[PDB]
């Protein structure tokens, strides 16, 4: 985490041994230490168990000659080292959330050598403990993304003095929100509770602390953090998480505490229900009195009368705080949120009391609305920013996957920090998963925005990947995380549909093929992993990539189906099938995530519907098959194709004729897939005469064109029946025709054998061209005919060329066309 | 194989039980049966072992009341059933290679019920036995492609009478050729022999017989089938394989028998060394006297004197055959090959004796050169066709993978059969692997070409896939086999290079992305397989697909590297890296095939070099890295980009400026990957004034253009500093400029909030356009400048539009450009 390259997998005299032949060195702690530090030290002890197979013993007396000595500045053992100048206590005293990690010789009598982890306060000590956890190899995501722990037999750590200094943002954390159906289902499946209890939140707290955050807004759609379980707040307070509430939840009451008793409580109008709402406020403050939770103040129900009533609500709330806490209101931390109604009041002069944090919000889509000017930056209480990775509302909700590329988060948050907003940073994380990477980035940036610039963003992603998957996997894993996040930034999954990208220009095909290419790369990486890494890889990379590449292909296929159905081309049916198959594959992938991956550990987390949005909300029953169209009796829907020119050319796959007239006995037969592109078409069988047979093609050409060059691509058939060679006649109906002999020189005569013969047969095709004058027509429509004059001619592709011809192995993209009857 | 849907996985009173609760029914055979039939029956007995865990007992007396009774028409038990009209003996007597498979009640006294497998001759009986093998689920490829056998506890087979009738081609088989280094290395690794001995060939024979072929040309570059091991011919003769030799190996002597003693033997000129060469011929015929091998006749060293000497050689060879065999020469089967020199002699009238098969050849690339006319079809000896899946020679060798799509094989071989060529079909198969599928198709077609037409080719591929991988895998496995074979038909791997496909038109990207998409589909299928199917899938599908998709991407990357290096664009370095990585991946894939897959069983088979061809032959040391180019000091090779218009537009990724002038303090900073396409560029940090800063772009426009529409795409930044909004100035240097305010209406005012505000911020970008008159310039070069007037403007993309603009999510493909200094 903080300090890279200081822990080694083998021992050394000038390094400090953390683990030797499977035996961990013991951890010394003051048995009366802050309990949250003790919990973290117990987690560290188990972290040594995950590494080596045996927990590091947690002792209360220096029984041993080598020790890991942990604690706060005021615990008995740490206090003794600072007093004896064995540790630079000045670097910690008065500092916020800071640790000092260093090896010292003879720290205590009877102890020869120790690693010291001293915190300026309880969170500083917890953070230093979790730094050691990451050194020995336990990712913050070891539980919440199943990131396995590499087993070890020996670990040593370099001497030196290490710290993360102080955090740059005072309160750094997350907001569980948009939490139904995913997080709520997962909690009910895991804990049996239709609410979040202290078991669930304890698990959330440990993750936030390991990530070095300190702050949480709890889930509140249909839950109440404070009311549902009395141990919720007690656990948060003990463990070291600062709790808060969102914008319109004043005075440490969760919204649902009012809603669940809306009939008993009244109006929520401060003018009529004033003493009912005052008592509401008071009870809340009483619940939190000796915790350090952040208190939202204010309220949302003429302009000057509104500004006055809000002024009264606030100073009323602050006398209630004074009353309950028994000390002046500024001794309790407070936050006041700017929303639309009160944004006007602010610009007219309205400010909270100056010790109060003023919380700003982004636009629900990751862009900051408003930042302090140089005159407003003065505000002694400072400023907050609320940022979205997930949103329910306009113009359409995004509830499914990560949509927040790393560049976007950084670009707006670096602006936020440079304008002086550094008291509170809190991110809407949805159900938490699958926002694991943007959460890590956002908290790391809140710790020290200074270490992030444009040139080094991806270094962060790389270190993240090396932590989750090992050095040897990190470059490629980070590349894929960065690139899929970028793709998801182009358009949310919920707003992606058949019309998002340009079909005719090739843009749709490009972005669909490129997402599938990303999937192929993720699959190759997946196959190189050890089995114990697969679930973490699926959660962090493979499922978002596979689900998005499948979703892109579904809508790309739908647009392809609609285009071909309009054109009356039976190929629409193939694309209808692909829409069905990909749509079902979406259900297969999320079934795997919920039920099979990690033995169903995350069942519930991936139940959000995403296919079938018609408005902004997800109030449709389930994932729904995108509408598709089918051509009845397709194998009889042939011929009748008419082409329009495009870019100085008409390019024609040979089976898309207008009409075909057969021979006596021999019939035009298309050979599916044959040749370089669509197919081949030939008179079958090769034993009958071809007299009178023909293929004809209908095409529109701009009347400005007076002569064309016709290219005809056929299979490199050799002259098996007659060494004169095969000929066919080619020309426009009512105009000039020429006869082409395409293989007279495909033989082993000395002048042919290597100059032409072996070159064209190894290529498998023959291209010939004639130049034909274009006679005048009233409508611009022409009929090109192909009359074979020998048996066995396999026609494949035609291009009539009047400027736009491009040399190419496939003979160019087919021009626009339609089918008739 | 022959009869589908007649074997069931559970028992039934009206079906015949082959396997019951793990116990197989016994196989009755005449203990004095033809030994090759006995070997096949022993293989059938072991096939029941692979299915159920216990071999079917092979007995010589009807000890049991239910039996599988097998044998030739003249074996004692079969002979008794035909005599008692229990079997329709008339349907078999006189017939060639035909079996009858049918359930009969009370076949023999003491036997209540039996499945009878009666052959018209030894191969007919062997074929009927192997039909039952496929019914119970043992693929012909169970050994040669590790196709696993589904375990069973119960099998029953429907009553009825089943046959494959008689084969349509008399001799059907393969030619091991181009066999070094792959097949030779695999044989040395597996058998320790620098030659093919009877252990190796016995394994080849069993495969050919299970595939229902009967013919082999043995490996002969540096081996001698007849001379290297005396059991080679004896095993072929016993087992039932007809042996032959290639065109210029007359009289059952392999070429190397002459070459290894070229100093002792002389000239190989029938005029000078006549009695030395006569004795050569005689010894050969003596070796084969009572086998049924096919004898090549003729010889290759004025025109009328040549036709006379060849006439003399032939009738000389035929008196030698008469002498050795003691019977007239026509009682020994003979074949005479047409090659170039003697093609003239044929058209002047020269024919072999009329009992001799006249062997024709394709062009070494799968196209038939010459077929009999209606007058020549008369030839009583009939005709052969030699067909290539592999070739060493012009214009360049193809030695690595399958290059023969199913459509091409069928289209030429159906022609071959319809013109009366049906005595000998033999395919050059290289090292045999990896031609497994075209071999199966080619032999199946030789058996009965009648059942193949254009509409049903892929049904064959589907049945093949269902046999190797199960019903549930068959559609998808066949789809991939068909599509990769088609791709390999476009250009051989050896002739593919950076120049094969069109780069500028998008064709190269298309075919590279589509091969990778095929790989992604193969990988998804691979993950659904049972572990015991993985090696067969890798051999038949995953390795050819992965190796080709990697090879395509390597050369596509090389062409991309060369284009960007020419343009002096540092992005060439990324593509240089991809060439290196893909080139090494080619070595990783074949290492896996040789050393890891199937525990190294096939080590040697995939050692052919394929990257580095400069001429027709593979006489370079090893796979060699394609040449790539790198730009030194790349992160300082920025700016200086000049664009040329294309298709009525100039499309510009914002970081490709010509020059950038910074502000006081704030500097132009590109944010890699940010936005929808290449990147974003912005003045950093957002706290300093932007006065005087600019980005300028140089572009050439046709002088016919008099006004343009300029689109500028920026990030949807909101007016955080000033609700007036952000502005930038945009215009041409020396011409008109306009000022754009791009976010004045991005707010929650009632007229903005849902009409524009939430729509554009959810899209993350803002596009604005101005219309600017185009002033005259002598050279057609223009400079467009972008001057930001507020902090925090994130520029992303520009398009100057004069006709060619297309609405698109990515704002079109960047126009041609170069970098300067
Ligand atoms: Ca969600
Ligand atoms: Ca501050
Ligand atoms: Ca679903
Ligand atoms: Ca080979
Ligand atoms: Ca015949
Ligand atoms: Ca190699």
Numbering used by the authors:
A (entry chain A), B (entry chain A): 0 to 300, 319 to 838
Paper excerpt:
The xylan-specific α-glucuronidases from glycoside hydrolase family 115 (GH115) specifically catalyse the removal of α-d-glucuronic acid (GlcA) or methylated GlcA (MeGlcA). In this study, we report crystal structures of a bacterial GH115 ortholog (wtsAgu115A) identified in a metagenome from an anaerobic digester fed with wastewater treatment sludge. Furthermore, wtsAgu115A eluted from a gel-filtration column at a volume consistent with a dimer in solution, which suggests that wtsAgu115A is a dimer in its active form similar to other GH115 xylan-specific α-glucuronidases.
